[PDB]
Amino acid sequence: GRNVAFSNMRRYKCTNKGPNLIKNWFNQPARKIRRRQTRLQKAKAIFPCPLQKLRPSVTRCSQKFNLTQRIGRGFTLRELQGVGLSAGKARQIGIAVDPRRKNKSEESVARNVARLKEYLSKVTIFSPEEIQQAIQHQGVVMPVVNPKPVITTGSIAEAKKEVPENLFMYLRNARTARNRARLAKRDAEREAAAK
Amino acid sequence: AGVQCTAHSWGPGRAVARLPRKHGGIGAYANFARGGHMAHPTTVIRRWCRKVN
């Protein structure tokens, strides 16, 4: 016994009977081989065409990761006006379309409009030898790379006009403002009742 | 393994040992008894794969 942190495990359920809940991964090498052949057969079905498709660049959701970008379901119709294409045409050129997606920023439309332009520039469309020697895209098309951060070498005096002196007080004043004003209503209300 | 048998202990006063006994009176379902389920059976859950950095 002694100082053991309490076990957080869950007592085993249906161990010898009912649902088979033990699923050992003994096929991990085997599954990887199976997926590779299937991916290779799909690539052969359209030799010029890429196996995967261009996906939109989207900001990762939630404050913790909201400064980097990840690949998403599809380009919005407003982002398709930038490349001047209808939804069906976009499917023909390999652009996946999320009609539900709403940009939520004008800035969002622009990073996406740039991504759409590159696909249209890079792609070559054929309706014999060229198709044989085309070379398809291997990998996610244009995988988005979040850049590493930098130092911008600005001027100290110019930046000092922006911040109030004793910055801590300014941040605290607006952090506690809802509470501080609320006390003022309670405080004034207490005074109103008597005198 | 060894569990594919119906054996229930005979009980004291019959003279024979109280271990699961098949209808015949033949020992069954015991780590020692002939044909019995191994005391703790070997199982695939053992981690055959160690990990190296």
Partner: protein, 84 residues
């Protein structure tokens, strides 16, 4: 708190994009003269006419469901008692 506190939120521009179908009302009037009122409603219109509306906002919430939809039932029913 339900949002992170950033004294300035908005380094990026934001999007600015965010009815009755009147023909149906014509369908409703034709049905209303063919059908009449609902029996719960006829009690509410009487309650509005003879005994206040506090009771006729309580009897609505009970016979219907929520206050927002009950206060509505008061408005639609109010016209019949007051107009005559």
């Amino acid at each position: 708190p339900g949002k992170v506190f950033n004294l300035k939120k908005g380094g990026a521009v934001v999007r600015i994009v965010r009815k009755t179908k009147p023909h149906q009302e014509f369908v409703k009037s034709i049905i209303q003269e063919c059908t009449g009122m609902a029996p719960y409603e006829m009690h509410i219109i009487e309650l509005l006419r003879m005994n206040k509306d506090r009771h006729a906002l309580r009897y609505a919430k009970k016979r219907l469901g929520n206050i927002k939809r009950a206060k509505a039932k008061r408005d639609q029913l109010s016209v019949y008692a007051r107009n005559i």
